[PDB]
Amino acid sequence: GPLSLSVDAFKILEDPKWEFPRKNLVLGKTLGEGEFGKVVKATAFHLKGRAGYTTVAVKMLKENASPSELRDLLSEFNVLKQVNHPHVIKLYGACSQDGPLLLIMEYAKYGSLRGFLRESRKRALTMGDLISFAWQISQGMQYLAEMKLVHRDLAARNILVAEGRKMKISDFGLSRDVYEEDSYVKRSQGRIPVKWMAIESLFDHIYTTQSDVWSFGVLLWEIVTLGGNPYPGIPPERLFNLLKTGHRMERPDNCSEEMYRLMLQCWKQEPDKRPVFADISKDLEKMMVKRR
Amino acid sequence: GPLSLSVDAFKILEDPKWEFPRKNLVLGKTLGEGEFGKVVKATAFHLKGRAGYTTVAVKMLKENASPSELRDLLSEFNVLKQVNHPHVIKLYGACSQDGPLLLIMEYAKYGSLRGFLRESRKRALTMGDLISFAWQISQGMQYLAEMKLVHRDLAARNILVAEGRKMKISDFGLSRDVYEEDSYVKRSQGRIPVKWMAIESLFDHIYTTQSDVWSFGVLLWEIVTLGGNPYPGIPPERLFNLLKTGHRMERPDNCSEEMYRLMLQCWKQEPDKRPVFADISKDLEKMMVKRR
Numbered sequence: 001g002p003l004s005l006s007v008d009a010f011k012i013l014e015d016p017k018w019e020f021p022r023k024n025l026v027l028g029k030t031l032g033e034g035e036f037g038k039v040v041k042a043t044a045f046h047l048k049g050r051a052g053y054t055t056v057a058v059k060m061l062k063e064n065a066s067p068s069e070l071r072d073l074l075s076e077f078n079v080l081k082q083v084n085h086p087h088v089i090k091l092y093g094a095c096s097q098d099g100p101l102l103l104i105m106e107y108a109k110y111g112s113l114r115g116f117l118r119e120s121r122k123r124a125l126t127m128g129d130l131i132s133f134a135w136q137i138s139q140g141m142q143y144l145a146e147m148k149l150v151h152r153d154l155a156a157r158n159i160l161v162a163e164g165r166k167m168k169i170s171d172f173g174l175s176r177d178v179y180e181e182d183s184y185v186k187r188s189q190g191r192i193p194v195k196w197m198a199i200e201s202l203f204d205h206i207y208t209t210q211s212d213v214w215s216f217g218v219l220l221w222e223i224v225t226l227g228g229n230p231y232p233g234i235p236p237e238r239l240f241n242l243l244k245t246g247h248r249m250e251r252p253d254n255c256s257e258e259m260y261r262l263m264l265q266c267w268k269q270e271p272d273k274r275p276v277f278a279d280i281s282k283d284l285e286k287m288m289v290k291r292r
Numbered sequence: 293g294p295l296s297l298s299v300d301a302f303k304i305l306e307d308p309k310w311e312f313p314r315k316n317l318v319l320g321k322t323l324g325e326g327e328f329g330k331v332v333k334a335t336a337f338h339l340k341g342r343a344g345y346t347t348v349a350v351k352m353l354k355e356n357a358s359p360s361e362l363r364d365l366l367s368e369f370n371v372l373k374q375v376n377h378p379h380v381i382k383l384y385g386a387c388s389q390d391g392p393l394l395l396i397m398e399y400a401k402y403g404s405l406r407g408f409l410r411e412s413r414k415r416a417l418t419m420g421d422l423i424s425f426a427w428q429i430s431q432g433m434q435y436l437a438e439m440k441l442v443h444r445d446l447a448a449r450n451i452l453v454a455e456g457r458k459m460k461i462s463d464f465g466l467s468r469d470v471y472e473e474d475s476y477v478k479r480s481q482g483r484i485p486v487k488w489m490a491i492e493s494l495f496d497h498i499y500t501t502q503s504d505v506w507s508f509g510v511l512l513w514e515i516v517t518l519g520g521n522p523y524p525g526i527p528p529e530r531l532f533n534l535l536k537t538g539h540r541m542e543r544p545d546n547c548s549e550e551m552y553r554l555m556l557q558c559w560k561q562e563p564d565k566r567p568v569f570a571d572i573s574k575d576l577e578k579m580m581v582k583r584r
């Protein structure tokens with residue numbers, strides 16, 4: 001089937017550019033396990049012409065991996081090979097011979113944005129620090145949108161915080177190319193959490209840059225609430241009726257009228273009425289210069 | 293889409309037979325979290341005409357549930373409503389109004405068969421105890437096969453051990469009706485662990501009772517090894533080439549020639565060359581009466 005073809009094609013791919021010797025890679029503690037698979041902290045000797053050990057993250061299959069998970073790992077390798085932007089996490093290489101498939105990723109010191117924000121208050125962050133975070137993520141998404149990639153899984157848990165508090169978009173297992181159609185559509189049910197999905201993704205299984213814009217809005221709410229839980233205390237099965245009847249999340253505490261206006265615009269029923277990421281970045285730039 | 297229809301249809305379904313009052317249900321400790329969702333230990337007042345509290349398991353959505361997980365919970369409710377066999381875990385009811393979807397299940401004291409076996413040795417189990425376990429599971433599968441249900445996810449982790457060491461087949465989130473076609477086929481990649489999938493499921497996405505027979509064979513190996521890890525130390529992406537080139541798991545230690553013959557028969561390339569569950573039960577009955 002489609003996966004057997006990908007596995008065989010990948011297993012014979014003689015790509016010295018990406019192939020890294022397993023013996024030069026040492027694995028350490030688990031950083032996280034979820035839908036994104038298993039991520040461990042690791043160190044790589046003589047990675048990408050750099051003398052000595054480089055600290056890296058290694059993504060790999062969890063115990064008892066399904067075709068779904070294997071397909072997502074190979075998909076991510078294929079996407080990240082072609083991506084290069086300071087606000088997207090980098091692939092450095094892979095080990096695909098004489099052991100499990102390992103993807104070697106750029107290390108982000110502070111871990112997930114959700115973790116970073118929940119650890120903090122107002123660590124002390126200003127509204128300007130938050131607008132900066134959102135802007136950095138908007139820039140990366142503008143680049144991905146230009147590359148005709150829909151991430152599909154934009155959320156605070158899928159943003160990494162690297163040295164200098166630099167946002168890195170992460171978890172490309174569900175990301176899809178849309179050069180052909182400017183939309184990605186699947187018959188089967190998606191694996192993106194309901195509470196981050198656009199109304200047209202949830203009802204009609206339609207994924208576009210503008211459904212990424214919806215997700216960014218939920219991410220904005222997560223950022224403004226310092227890692228709040230979206231639609232708190234509302235079961236996910238209620239999101240069908242809630243969204244369809246025109247309901248959205250209330251303006252949260254410590255949120256400007258302008259900032260909440262941006263969230264609401266990201267959650268317009270009609271995808272074409274939503275801003276594009278370039279607009280979002282301009283709206284965030286404007287908030288920054290006006291002062292926090 | 294298909295899920296919005298299921299959610300709305302289910303949310304208006306006036307089924308007093310299955311609907312249980314939320315106020316009569318008290319949730320306790322988490323028993324497990326995985327692909328099957330979240331399962332908690334609980335107690336139900338005046339369940340199914342029984343006076344007082346009954347100890348039960350409650351299945352519910354994990355944090356940040358996807359459409360996939362919600363679809364699987366509703367699918368399981370629909371399947372277990374129509375199933376009744378002493379070696380299949382029972383649905384007792386559901387809470388679907390004024391809070392999250394909760395499925396109320398029969399409680400199995402000893403938890404997973406994988407856990408039970410790994411906890412034990414030769415707790416002391418005989419080859420007769422193991423053949424009994426396998427037989428009980430074969431009987432339940434014969435009943436499901438007759439009902440035109442393909443489980444798809446048969447493994448030691450998805451068998452429960454109840455009072456009297458009675459096997460209960462569990463985790464019906466991935467089970468599908470095949471009355472129409474005698475096969476279930478999906479375009480997208482499945483969420484069954486690779487190492488339990490039949491070769492025709494893995495390559496061609498074809499699920500039948502005979503692919504359940506393949507899975508039962510891996511379960512037999514799990515039972516005989518007291519919860520071993522199938523194809524140990526072999527990455528799941530190697531299973532394509534391994535299975536296609538005619539390789540299968542070696543006869544494990546403390547396994548009869550007859551018992552291993554049954555495993556191999558369950559893993560024949562050609563589904564029609566595999567035994568049916570009725571045959572499997574007869575082969576296990578024969579081993580029992582001959583003596584352990």
Ligand SMILES: NC(=O)c1ccc(-c2cnn3ccc(NCc4cccnc4)nc23)cc1
Nearest residue numbers: 031032057105106107108111112157170171
């Ligand atoms: N391509 C990828 O998906 C990916 C994922 C994670 C990493 C990664 C790099 N440094 N680092 C530090 C902590 C950490 N904690 C688990 C986590 C957090 C957020 C999101 N996922 C996992 N992860 C990391 C790098 C790449």
Ligand SMILES: NC(=O)c1ccc(-c2cnn3ccc(NCc4cccnc4)nc23)cc1
Nearest residue numbers: 323324349397398399400403404449462463
């Ligand atoms: N319909 C269902 O899928 C289901 C699942 C689990 C239960 C359930 C009943 N008693 N009990 C005790 C322990 C336990 N531990 C988690 C576990 C173990 C095996 C498999 N899954 C979860 N689970 C249970 C009942 C029904």
